[PDB]
Each structure stands twice: as structure tokens, then as C-alpha cells.
């Protein structure tokens, strides 16, 4: 399982530009197609973003002591950010996202 937690901000056609909201990024799949589910602590129906053949870039930036900010840009220009992630968890997610981006 690949799931990370922290304040989330998204810029996309399906969400508009959201404010920072506590939640999680979780990896899901079906017949080799990989997607990402955004769940918020406040609830509501989670939104899903395709990852397979849809990742443009993944950037990690320091977010204080032992934490990182992960920034995922998709090929449709959707921008997903997750902040204050324990650095080891953020690096594992980045490694996985890089492998998906490289069709592995």
C-alpha cells in the first residue's frame, strides 16, 4: 500500500484551485492502470487522478525538519501538492511515481 498524509492543495479543471486541506494521497489500480485517490479528513466523495501515461513531473521540496512537500504535475496540467509529509514517506512516493512515469 502507498498512502501519504498532510495538508493538500490542488489546481485542476475538476477541482478549481483549492485551499490547503488535510487529507491523503493513496495509490489505487486496475489491470495495470495506476491512479491516485485524494481523500479529505472533512469527508465528501474522493476524487481520482489517473497516473499511468499521465505524469509530467514530480518535485520534492523541504518542508521543515524531517518533512517534505511533494508536487505532482500531470500531463493534463493538473497540479497536486501535499505538504508536511515525513521525508522517508515522501521519497518512497516520489520513487513510485517516477517508476509509473517511466512505464514500470
Automatic annotation (TrEMBL):
<feature type="domain" description="Ubiquitin carboxyl-terminal hydrolase 37 pleckstrin homology-like">
    <location>
        <begin position="2"/>
        <end position="103"/>
    </location>
</feature>
<protein>
    <recommendedName>
        <fullName>ubiquitinyl hydrolase 1</fullName>
    </recommendedName>
</protein>
<comment type="similarity">
    <text>Belongs to the peptidase C19 family.</text>
</comment>
